[PDB]
Symmetry: C2
Subunit: 233 residues, 2 copies
């Protein structure tokens, strides 16, 4: 058994990006020595994925393992630049460890670029509040149901013409529909409110599902994404 | 293979203003007994876009209902979807997906493009990105394997290009595995930056589908372009 810990020196960048320093902690909490591989990666808006390592010449390194003995622990510091060209929005930093026996351990932290950390995602005046209703992060292999709350609040002076949908992006290349495409013309000060659930049928493959919601202002053409995780065991 | 899935699109090339795509879905039971399944049509696009083929007038309240085909029987239906102008130009994959009652997953995919040429390399305004699975290796053994990728960025501009480049493998269990560290190159006019980079799939890595994801950025214009390939670890 391994314990992975991740800490970011800062969690909010202005629109022109900046530097983020990470404190990586990998602890072996067992009597036996453990062999493993680890790395640090970033997920972001608009399909951005990138490695935390950046090189001055040509990348030619391999992925090397590590070993920790009884109660022993690894501690490293790694930083990375988030450049201005990257989309404003929410990013997830992921410290990932795969032990020799196939066990996966992950420690994540979020940072934002160009938006307030403690504000709802937003399209001008239109706030987007989409949540895993009861904080259910996994379901049994024999199946389970997970409800999500959806609240699109139009804080604008004018009406908002929006499109909304959700999928579940999972194992084996699956993209399961969770919410069909809906269109709503929402008056100033009004709200689109709704609860939507997905039934994870017993037949669906085990692994990680990213419940991915999308909201578009079809007049401005701007799009906002909200991603949430559910594991089927 | 107990189920055979087929997908056809009525057109594969849209202009930047988007348009409407009609499709034929075929699901055939190749076996001699009844098969129960669920199926749907979904789209994957540039800039992290994913959307279902289905659109509704009001509130969507339905659930994915099951279907069944007796021995030798087949289901044929049609689905259509609008590709709005606001969606990013680039490559899209339409996917017919079937999950049988026993967990078996069958897929049939087709591609369309929006606002770019159908048979042309991905491009950043004169700089072409040619990234390929070198030996057409689509899967590796559970005990491990290695897959090399060729990388070629041709600069057909009049001036020099400043690019940033990297690669990850996006896989099962939320893994995002570094394949190529972030590099910055200056490529002169008429030049081609050429490289080969592979990923070792260690034995310990989880079984399933890995999307090898390459990204290229014109660090002057800020424009980004992606190239995706699939390797399956058995």
């Amino acid at each position: 058994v391994i314990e992975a810990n991740l800490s970011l020196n800062q969690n909010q960048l202005a629109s022109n990006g900046g530097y983020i320093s990470s404190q990586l902690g990998i602890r072996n909490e067992s009597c036996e020595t453990v062999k493993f591989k680890y790395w640090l990666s970033i997920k972001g808006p608009e399909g951005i994925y990138f490695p935390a390592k950046a090189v001055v010449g040509v990348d030619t390194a391999q992925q090397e393992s590590d070993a920790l003995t009884d109660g022993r622990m690894l501690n490293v510091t790694r930083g990375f630049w988030v450049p201005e060209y990257m989309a404003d929005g929410k990013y997830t930093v992921s410290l990932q460890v795969v032990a020799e026996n196939g066990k996966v351990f992950k420690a994540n932290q979020e940072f934002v670029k160009g938006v307030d950390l403690n504000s709802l995602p937003e399209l001008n005046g239109l706030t987007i509040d989409i949540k895993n209703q009861f904080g259910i992060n996994s379901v049994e292999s024999t199946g389970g149901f997970v409800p999500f709350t959806v609240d699109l609040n139009n804080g604008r002076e004018g009406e908002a013409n929006v499109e909304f949908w959700m999928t579940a992006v999972g194992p084996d290349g699956l993209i399961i529909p969770v919410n069909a495409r809906e269109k709503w013309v929402i008056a100033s000060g009004d709200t689109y409110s709704k609860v939507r659930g997905i039934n994870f049928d017993k037949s669906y493959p085990a692994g990680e599902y990213t419940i991915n919601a999308q909201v578009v202002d079809i007049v401005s053409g701007e799009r906002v994404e909200q991603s949430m995780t559910v594991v089927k065991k």
